[PDB]
Amino acid sequence: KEKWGIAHIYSSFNNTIIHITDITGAETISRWSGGMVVKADRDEPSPYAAMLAARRAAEEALEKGIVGVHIRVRAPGGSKSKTPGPGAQAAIRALARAGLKIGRVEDVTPIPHDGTRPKGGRRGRRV
Template sequence: MSKRKVREPKEDNVTLGPATREGELVFGVAHIFASFNDTFIELGINALHIKLRATGGNKTKTPGPGAQSALRALARSGMKIGRIEDVTPVPTDSTRRKSGRRGRRL
């Protein structure tokens, strides 16, 4: 009988993102969607440009309460923050408000 060949496990270097030098910043984008019920965060690489988004329409356009705490958590985790933008969709002409033809009657 012949000896079995034993494969040695190969170690693969897996890199996520582009190749950078030591100390070089690569800016990614963190999309923060903050509604009043939920907060979603999509992250970039090792330094961030942040885009905040709230729910659209013709009600309040302010980001929900989770947006500021998510920003604070990203800053405390050691991420470098480049710029912060608000990309909430705002209608150019006003959208039609919720009520009938004659408005809300009391």
């Protein structure tokens, strides 16, 4: 009789998304992102915005009855960056603090086995 779900965190260099679903992941419970909390695009990937979005999502999950969550951190992966953005550990800490028990913590970034060609050309970004 324990309510355990899964908290998927999408962390990038432009935004952070916190999405709380059931144990099977087929039932959305709460979904919050930085852009729905902060007013500026530059502030979207900030750890403060991640913490606020995580707090709102945790409050919604607690209201709906979820008491524990399994963390699933994810960078964009694929041909894009494979490292999580700044607002991932902050979101995890906010989830732990807001009143949700924390279970397994794993990284589920999609790692290609020599997949598609990344964008930017053979010379990359030249800034």
